Design a protein around this ligand. Structure first.
Ligand SMILES: [Mn+2]
Length: 596
């Protein structure tokens, strides 16, 4: 932290001074990303009452939030574009609520800003965070400058992005301007809840792609305040990607190594698994196979000159949902969060550790708990000890299975893209698309039952129909080595209501089959919905009692209903903005189903 701003290049300096004149902070501090700066931030936050130390651990801390500020606020998150159709398709003609993004006119946006930001930082320091999304020397990296009046945001941004000398050295006119305030100018007129400043009634999270800008007011929480997280890495980046010939996606990236030493990378989009345990940190249950994590949330991907789709993880840390995390379910996540981690809204134990539903850390008898609301808590309370959206924020380099190339500036070559869903019947364990357009249709048809095309529903940066068009056009690149496209479902239930598939490390068996399909192996049989493994070409050895036929249902009634639902979904939500190729894939599926 320094009051000297001389190191900022002219455009970044102009942005900072604009924000200073608007917000009227007490002082202005440039962030340098150093260990000493982190200690200073922590000291101030503890003195402020925001952070509680967690002396059970090495350098871990706990924040609690006002209960009104605990998650992204979708209804207050908007895309600002001169033309509404650049942002979103027509509103559902039958009157249903829009589900593919919210639009705000420039006029309305500017008026909203003028009600909120003038003087909003009175009495507070403004912090300047120059940051890189991706290794700063990557040709795929993009830079930002975030100004904020929240030290909690600064600490978390330092974990989640690259903040440091390397960033300032590269900064020029081309960066995303990110303006953030918690919206609680001093002096306060009433006490805070849990020392957590916010202005819930006036929260606004706005994206203005034509101005390379994000503006966020009133929330200190996660996706609303850590402007790299979602606002930049998905919403602004997706529109940049459409304009510049790349892809910005809500996908984990993993490396899979076969027993005999070949390595392939895969990306996967899962809805409602955002922040949760996934494939990316999996300990495989097939001997000899290895899995490494490149990223577990965002993938930025671009074809190289050889036609290979290269991906980077544009983040530097994990911002994961805490409840359900345990040594049993995710030992790699547990290792990651054991030190130098900031926890938000988890329980606090009498021995100086943390608590959430599912945690299996051994504790001595008589250890007691305080909930995220700061109240005594015991098992059986109607309310959970940790808020369901409570978080850890930890550096990625602490994850024991990080891929050697996880921060390689060149990116990793992607050979498969996997879409995920959670369905108790009908949708098989794994299916491969017949080709690119068919695969784009599969991604468009994802569910979470809510539809969540490409796991991007809350995160589109521009018209979702044009996003689908952009995916289709991407497949036309000459000499592209297009990844194969798959859809998976870990969650089928048997004629007794329990899971057919054991999941967890056994999911490596599905990745192994995918791996073979990448290599061109003749290990599939055709069905109305795509290729599936031949019985015996999915490794079920060591899984006695697992019934292949219940993993690969082919139910005509299910698919007839699925097509009816998709037809209604596309009609209402995309209308004429749906690409013809997607409708053609639905029509194709309908006809194959008719004959089945
Ligand atoms: Mn996510």
């Amino acid at each position: 932290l320094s009051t000297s701003l001389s190191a900022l290049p002219a455009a970044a300096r102009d942005f900072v001074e604009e924000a200073v004149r608007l917000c009227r902070p007490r002082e202005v501090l440039l962030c340098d990303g150093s260990e000493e700066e982190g200690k200073e931030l922590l000291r101030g936050l503890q003195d402020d009452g925001v952070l509680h130390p967690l002396p059970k651990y090495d350098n871990c801390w706990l924040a609690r939030t006002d209960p009104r500020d605990v998650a992204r606020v979708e209804s207050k998150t908007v895309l600002v574009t001169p033309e509404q159709s650049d942002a979103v398709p027509p509103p559902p003609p039958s009157g249903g609520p829009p589900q593919l993004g919210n639009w705000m006119s420039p006029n309305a946006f500017q008026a909203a800003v003028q009600e909120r930001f003038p003087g909003c930082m009175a009495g507070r320091p403004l912090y300047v965070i120059p940051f890189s999304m991706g290794p700063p020397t990557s040709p795929l990296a993009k830079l930002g400058v975030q100004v904020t009046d929240s030290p909690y945001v600064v600490l978390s941004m330092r974990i989640m992005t690259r903040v440091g000398p390397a960033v300032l050295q590269r900064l020029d006119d081309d960066f995303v301007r990110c303006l953030h305030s918690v919206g609680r100018p001093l002096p306060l007129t009433e006490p805070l809840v849990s020392s957590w400043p916010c202005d819930p009634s006036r929260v606004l999270v706005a994206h203005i792609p034509s101005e390379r800008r994000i503006v966020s007011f009133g929330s200190g929480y996660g996706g609303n305040s850590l402007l790299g997280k979602k606002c930049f890495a998905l919403r602004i980046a997706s529109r940049m990607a459409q304009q510049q010939g790349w892809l910005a996606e809500h996908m984990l990236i993993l490396g899979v190594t076969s027993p005999s030493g070949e390595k392939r990378y895969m990306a996967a989009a899962f809805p409602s698994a955002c922040g949760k345990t996934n494939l990316a940190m999996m300990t495989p249950s097939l001997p000899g196979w290895r899995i490494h994590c490149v990223g577990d949330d965002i993938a930025w991907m671009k074809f190289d000159d050889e036609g290979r789709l290269r991906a980077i993880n544009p983040e530097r840390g994990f911002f994961g949902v805490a409840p359900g995390t345990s040594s049993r379910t995710n030992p790699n996540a547990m290792a990651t969060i054991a030190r130098n981690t900031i926890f938000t809204n988890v329980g606090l134990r009498s021995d100086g550790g943390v608590y959430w539903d599912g945690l299996d850390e051994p504790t001595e008898p008589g250890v007691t708990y305080t909930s995220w609301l700061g109240k005594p808590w015991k098992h059986g309370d109607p309310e959970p000890c940790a808020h369901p959206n409570s978080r850890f924020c930890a550096p990625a380099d602490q994850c024991p299975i990080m891929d050697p190339r996880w921060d390689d500036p060149e990116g990793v070559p992607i050979d498969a893209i996997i879409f995920g869903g959670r369905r108790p019947r009908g949708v098989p364990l794994v299916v491969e698309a017949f080709g690119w357009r068919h695969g784009v249709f599969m991604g468009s048809a994802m569910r979470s039952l809510m539809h969540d095309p490409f796991a991007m529903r809350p995160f589109f940066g521009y018209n979702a129909g044009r996003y689908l068009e952009h995916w289709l056009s991407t497949g036309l690149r000459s000499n592209a080595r297009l990844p194969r496209l798959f859809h998976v479902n870990w969650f089928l239930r048997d004629n007794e209501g329990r899971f057919v598939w054991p999941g967890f490390g056994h999911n490596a068996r599905v990745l192994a089959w995918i791996f073979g399909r990448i290599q061109g192996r003749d290990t599939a049989r055709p069905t109305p919905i795509g290729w599936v493994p031949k019985e015996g070409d999915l490794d079920l050895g060591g899984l006695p009692g697992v019934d292949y036929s219940q993993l690969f249902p082919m139910e005509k009634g299910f698919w007839e209903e699925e097509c009816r639902q998709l037809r209604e979904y596309y009609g209402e939500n995309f209308g004429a903005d749906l690409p013809r190729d997607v409708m053609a894939e639905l029509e194709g599926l309908e006809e194959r189903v008719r004959k089945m």
